[PDB]
Amino acid sequence: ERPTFYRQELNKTIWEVPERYQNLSPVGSGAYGSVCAAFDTKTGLRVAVKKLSRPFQSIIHAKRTYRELRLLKHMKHENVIGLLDVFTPARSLEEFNDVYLVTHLMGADLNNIVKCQKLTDDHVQFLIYQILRGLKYIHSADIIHRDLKPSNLAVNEDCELKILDFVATRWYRAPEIMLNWMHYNQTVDIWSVGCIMAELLTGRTLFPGTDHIDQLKLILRLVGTPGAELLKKISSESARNYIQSLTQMPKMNFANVFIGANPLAVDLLEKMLVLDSDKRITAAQALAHAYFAQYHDPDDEPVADPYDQSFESRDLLIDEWKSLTYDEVISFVPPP
Ligand SMILES: CN1CCN(c2cc(-c3ccncc3)c(-c3ccc4ccccc4c3)nn2)CC1
Ligand SMILES: CN1CCN(c2cc(-c3ccncc3)c(-c3ccc4ccccc4c3)nn2)CC1
Ligand SMILES: Fc1ccc(-c2n[nH]cc2-c2ccncc2)cc1
Ligand SMILES: [Cl-]
């Protein structure tokens, strides 16, 4: 049945967890929750435990908590962060106030590595391959990450990588988002991967915009201003007006700009950093690119089971979201 919990204070934050998790030590605190590293006595593993912050403070938080838990329960893939456990010290629904999440402890993030070292081409291949392999899986479930950036990619000393949260976010954001298009597709993530890869190859942020306008200017400076086919797809009169009012600029030659890099890496960047999102390479297609010949195995790049996102369009009471979250905590089945 229920296990025994113990209590402690870590950085002005209260942590009430089962006895199986020991030696809690803070790893960091996000705007959405705090994280502690710990030892899982039952498995002999190092784990990271995240305590959600104010999970049911409002309808927005409640829905976000539910979303997070449903997503995490669904993700089962080597390159996507998954759930080893989820628990609450509450014995019933009426006293339900806190949600704790548990996953494999990861030593660092990709931002921590690119700052210290400049990666070899072999490392760039394996890291990007892993990102795409994870993204193929996520995209197959009709999910869009939307916020890929180095700091959201967890990496261990072994160069194994996992996508988390599914250096300014803005720098890795697709241009169509800077234009406020409300019908962007899963290819916004491919754009972010392009930005991440370029940075791994050159050691420098590809588009360090200071605001949305500047960000767009830096982008068009590299890939050129929109051609006629892309202009026809812009419904926003003001955005269309703005873009056409800019001084036209030609697409730069990627081979010149990234000269020194492996020509295959360059070819791929060019397929990812396409201005028109309908023409960007998909994660599945990218995995087959010759740049990943040493890693690509079509029989081991799985797709996800269907993911029901219908709850996203629902308008429920806080207690309803809280109760749905509770059922999801109770029905959780740990991995093998
Ligand atoms: C109130 N009693 C029972 C609960 N307590 C526990 C339980 C465990 C435990 C852990 C995992 N599964 C079941 C029970 C442990 C425990 C069990 C094993 C451990 C191994 C290495 C280091 C610390 C360890 C702590 N300690 N107190 C305190 C005394
Ligand atoms: C700037 N980045 C830094 C790292 N971030 C993280 C890291 C982790 C983490 C840390 C260490 N090992 C594994 C993961 C987590 C984290 C920590 C614990 C988790 C438990 C269950 C499910 C997901 C979890 C995610 N969140 N943001 C986001 C902000
Ligand atoms: F300047 C730009 C930058 C990006 C785009 C863009 N790429 N893919 C889709 C779009 C787009 C942007 C706005 N509205 C529809 C489509 C269009 C113009
Ligand atoms: Cl954090």
Length of the chain: 336
Residues 6+ apart with CB under 8 A from 67: 311, 312
Q: Quick count: other Cβ atoms within 10 Å of Cβ 88?
A: 19
Structure solved via? X-ray
Quoted resolution (Å)? 2.1
Q: Quick count: other Cβ atoms within 10 Å of Cβ 290?
A: 9
User: What residue type is assigned to position 77 of the chain?
Assistant: H
User: What residue type is assigned to position 154 of the chain?
Assistant: A
Q: Which residues surround ligand 4, an ion (CB under 5 A)?
A: 28, 30
Do residues 329 and 69 lie in contact, with contact meaning Cβ atoms separated by under 8 Å?
A: yes
User: Token match 């309908």: residue?
Assistant: 278
Residue 24: both structure tokens together: 């809690």
Residues 262, 309: Cα–Cα separation, whole Å: 40
- Tell me if 106 CB under 6 Å of ligand 2: yes
Q: Going by CATH, does the domain composed of 2-107+304-333 fall within 3.30.200.20?
A: yes
Best mutation site among 8, 21, 41 for ligand 1 pocket (most ligand atoms within 8 Å of CB): 41
User: Token match 């890869």: residue?
Assistant: 197
Q: Is 134 annotated as a binding residue?
A: no
Q: Residue with the nearest Cα to atom 7 of ligand 3?
A: 276
Q: Quick count: other Cβ atoms within 10 Å of Cβ 150?
A: 22
DSSP 91: S
Domain with CATH 3.30.200.20 in the chain: 2-107+304-333
- Ligand 1 atom with the smallest distance to the CA of 4 is 4
Do residues 27 and 35 lie in contact, with contact meaning Cβ atoms separated by under 8 Å?
A: yes
**Of 109, 87, 279, whose CA–CA distance to 194 is shortest?**
279
Q: Can 299 be counted among the known catalytic residues?
A: no
Q: Kindly list the protein residues whose Cβ atom lies closer than 6 A to any atom of ligand 1.
A: 4, 19-20, 22, 41-42
Do residues 80 and 163 lie in contact, with contact meaning Cβ atoms separated by under 8 Å?
A: yes
Residue 288: both structure tokens together: 């087959």
What number does CATH give the domain 108-303?
1.10.510.10
Residues 73, 272: Cα–Cα separation, whole Å: 30
Catalytic residue among 147, 165, 214, 267: 165
DSSP for 236-287, please give it. Answer: -HHHHHHHHHSPP-PPP-HHHHTBTB-HHHHHHHHHHS-SSGGGSPPHHHHH
Quote the crossing angle between the two packed helices 59-74 and 318-331, to the nearest 10°: 20
3-state secondary structure 151-167: HHEEECCCCCEEECCCC
**Of 38, 9, 4, whose CA–CA distance to 21 is shortest?**
38
Do residues 153 and 106 lie in contact, with contact meaning Cβ atoms separated by under 8 Å?
A: no
- Tell me if 277 CB under 6 Å of ligand 3: yes
Q: Which value, to the nearest 10 degrees, does the dihedral of the CA atoms of residues 271, 273, 277, 283 take?
A: 60
Residues 6+ apart with CB under 8 A from 255: 263, 266
Measure Cα distances from 327 to 36, 93, 96, 309, 320 in Å. Answer: 25, 9, 11, 17, 11
**Of 268, 266, 249, 247, whose CA–CA distance to 257 is shortest?**
266
Q: Is 323 annotated as a binding residue?
A: no
- Tell me if 243 CB under 6 Å of ligand 3: yes
**Of 51, 6, 59, whose CA–CA distance to 32 is shortest?**
51
Residues 315, 323: Cα–Cα separation, whole Å: 14
Q: In the Cβ-directed half-sphere of 261, how many Cα atoms lie within 13 Å?
A: 26
Q: Which ligand is nearest to the CA of 174?
A: 3
Residue 23: both structure tokens together: 């030696």
**Of 124, 119, 109, whose CA–CA distance to 161 is shortest?**
109
User: What residue type is assigned to position 134 of the chain?
Assistant: G
Q: Which ligand is nearest to the CA of 86?
A: 2
* 3-class state of residue 72 by DSSP: helix
Q: Residue with the nearest Cα to atom 28 of ligand 1?
A: 19
Residues 160, 77: Cα–Cα separation, whole Å: 12
Q: Which ligand is nearest to the CA of 40?
A: 1
Domain with CATH 1.10.510.10 in the chain: 108-303
Q: How far is the CA of 295 from the centre of ligand 2 (A)?
A: 26
Do residues 98 and 325 lie in contact, with contact meaning Cβ atoms separated by under 8 Å?
A: no
Q: How far is the CA of 142 from the centre of ligand 3 (A)?
A: 21
Residue 46: both structure tokens together: 């190092």
Residues 238, 175: Cα–Cα separation, whole Å: 15
Do residues 287 and 295 lie in contact, with contact meaning Cβ atoms separated by under 8 Å?
A: no
DSSP for 203-232, please give it. Answer: SS-S---SSHHHHHHHHHHHH-S--HHHHT
Q: Is 172 annotated as a binding residue?
A: no
